[PDB]
Design a protein around this ligand. Structure first.
Ligand SMILES: OC[C@H]1O[C@@H](O)[C@H](O)[C@@H](O)[C@@H]1O
Ligand SMILES: OC[C@H]1O[C@@H](O)[C@H](O)[C@@H](O)[C@@H]1O
Lengths: 207, 207
DNA sequence: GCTACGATCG
DNA sequence: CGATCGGTAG
DNA sequence: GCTACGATCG
DNA sequence: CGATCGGTAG
């Protein structure tokens, strides 16, 4: 059904105006691939790792993380993460601060302090903001990324994203890099598929 | 001695490169006027009020604040502020959130929870960041503004300031609005007078 | 060969 | 405040 | 006549 | 997440 969702999203975006129709046509079908099968602790750690880093840099770090902490080159279990000292994690490429935060997330998972996937699925984005922000290292941007790339939510507009703001400036022909609320206002017509709208804006550099 | 300080600062900035020399020449003498005579609670409230607002908008609000809470059109005392309900403060132009934060600051002053001016004068900017950030509504930007406009510190670079970032993009000929650390790096040569350098960049729009 | 591009800590 | 992890495009 | 331009809260 | 106080330049 993700296919039907993307088709509906693409049709909606193409109905907004000339610029959206043109962008969707040039970029082609949305190929965004979320991974809801991932447990919350994994999705959260993947989101934290991506903070301030490009996809390529993030992937290189996660790859080393899996090779170091896992036995079957898979994503490390909470236990395996706790059995790895922060210095070893840092050696994988995580900043020292992220190394500490990842340890805390693993421990929270082991102690059942993180909401279950079942609970998270019933929570609105606003409720997720209130709940997950209680985790050290996890705030607005990280929760938006977890919502898009792990949960697969379709109407998330990461208006605070620097890259998206730069792309919105070009796309909307603005005289200056927009503030967060300005991006929120400009992309309102994209509802209820703002995640897909964000994805299309993120593809502009590739063009 | 503030005059000798500004003269020294202007001479230093003019010794960096062509662009700084030219900017200082075009803008003229630095006319920044700090107000260290203001008590910490006043400087902090003035800084909070200025959050996200232009100087003109900020002044209009403070003007109403003084007329409403003071008896002699002067800046309200901590007691006078506490005697004013948050709804009345909101009517002066303060956002509802700022109204609550200003009440908290006034109460902190009455309860001697804010460091004394004497202590603040002995604290480094880093120490002020650690100390004053414990106040609701007061974080990095606000502390930088308090340091510049109230304390009169000369080497404060508010690298996180949106306006300054926009001006730095133009001044340094950057292809994109710079990130905070980029502004920090680009203005390093301005030490030990980065407050004055920031002031000159803030004058670019006037030109 | 060289630069720039989340959220937390004293 | 002023740093932080890194692949890669300009 | 009309738009845009810190830090906190459920 | 998605708002928030307002004078004023474009
Ligand atoms: O990390 C998630 C996303 O963050 C954005 O800032 C980057 O521009 C995207 O390419 C990346 O997929
Ligand atoms: O509020 C203090 C300063 O904040 C900056 O963002 C504005 O551009 C300055 O004009 C103002 O004086």
């Amino acid at each position: 059904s993700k296919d039907s969702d993307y088709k509906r999203a693409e049709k909606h975006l193409s109905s907004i105006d000339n610029k959206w129709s043109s962008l969707v046509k040039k970029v082609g079908p949305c190929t965004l691939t979320p991974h809801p099968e991932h447990a919350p602790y994994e999705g959260i750690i993947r989101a934290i790792t991506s903070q301030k880093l490009s996809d390529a840099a993030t992937n290189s770090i996660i790859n080393k993380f899996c090779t170091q902490c896992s036995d079957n080159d898979e994503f490390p279990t909470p236990k395996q993460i706790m059995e790895t000292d922060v210095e070893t994690l840092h050696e994988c490429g995580f900043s020292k601060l992220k190394s500490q935060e990842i340890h805390i997330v693993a421990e929270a998972a082991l102690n059942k302090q993180i909401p279950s996937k079942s609970e998270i699925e019933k929570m609105s984005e606003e409720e997720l903001m209130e709940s997950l922000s209680k985790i050290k290292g996890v705030k607005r941007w990280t929760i938006e990324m977890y919502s898009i790339f792990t949960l697969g939510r379709l109407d998330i507009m990461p208006a605070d994203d620097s890259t998206l703001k730069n792309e919105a400036k070009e796309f909307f022909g603005l005289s200056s890099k927009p503030q967060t609320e300005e991006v929120e206002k400009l992309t309102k017509p994209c509802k209820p598929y703002r995640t897909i709208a964000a994805w299309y804006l993120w593809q502009i550099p590739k063009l």
